[PDB]
Amino acid sequence: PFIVALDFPSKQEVERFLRPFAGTPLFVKVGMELYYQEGPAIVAFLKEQGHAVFLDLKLHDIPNTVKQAMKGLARVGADLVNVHAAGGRRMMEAAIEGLDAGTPSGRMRPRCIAVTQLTSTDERMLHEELWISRPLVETVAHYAALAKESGLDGVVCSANEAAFIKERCGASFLAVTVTPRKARALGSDYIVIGRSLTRAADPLRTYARLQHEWN
């Protein structure tokens, strides 16, 4: 249920933070700052350590490009990827094809969720800048539906946004997102952990604590 955001400025420190987890597998997130500096090598490392990877690059391009890229991210070793719903139904559908195409027969393709509206986008922005004329809340549900219709597995959403989306898309539509306890109460499926864990003095015990608050 936990996705540890490896928001570190180098492979050096990533490696350092993960040392105690050499015996405790984790579901980790690789953002675009780290991936653009380390390349596919960082995923190989994480995979070797035995961790599952969420390659968070938010692909948003034309259908065929996202497809070939997703095919490549499958080959790389990602367990979860994401895209912008703003990319359109066609692009999202092509992303899924790319994943199956880069996934060996029998085995399961890497999960793929969609960004609806970034957590940093407020009403004023949706209104004046993006020129979308429907409340932020409805716009998020719409994009989430678009993603569900396109064959995606879920979406990235604010904790108190999860119930609304699941009501619209089905309770099996993943909600990746406050207290782990609160997060769980709001309907999220996965919680993205940041400094809370990555900057703790006792990472292994903090992680155990984390699982207990959620339980």
Added chain:
Amino acid sequence: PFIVALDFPSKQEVERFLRPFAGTPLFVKVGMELYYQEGPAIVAFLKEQGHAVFLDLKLHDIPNTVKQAMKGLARVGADLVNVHAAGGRRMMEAAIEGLDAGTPSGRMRPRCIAVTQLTSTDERMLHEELWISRPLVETVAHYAALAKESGLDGVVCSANEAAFIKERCGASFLAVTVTPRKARALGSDYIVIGRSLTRAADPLRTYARLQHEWN
């Protein structure tokens, strides 16, 4: 004036095509399919060869993330990067900061242009899927205006779209995009060359032809 899209499935194939240009510097584009499989090393290679590099990754994320990622792409040696205007003025302004922060003093930061509406997005998609209520053309100029307001140097646009853009943003706002000669008459600053060059049996001769037709 020419930006060669290195749309090849592998680094070997890329190095194979560029061999004859070992003595003829080019402005090349690295898409997300190639960059996500070769990482920052492919840029180093291109840089070693003496080519300028357009890292076309269309970053679209929260402000701080794009900023840290741009600082990194500058360190990687990118001469031109891009972003989605859909990310908002704040994210776009943050991209410029990251680029400056990753550029040595006295040196020039790498250029940054924005995607307004992907060339693969049609009227129906903008209407039904995105929730944007203004015509496609007006939304494009708007987003371009948004990018100009943010400090970006230009945008990616259709050949027959640059006149409208420059009229709205200023003749100095770059238009990166039909025949070379045609693309020129339509107001574009740069034309992305595809298979017509990368799959030419006589690339050096062909390259000379393009420059002549443009001239």
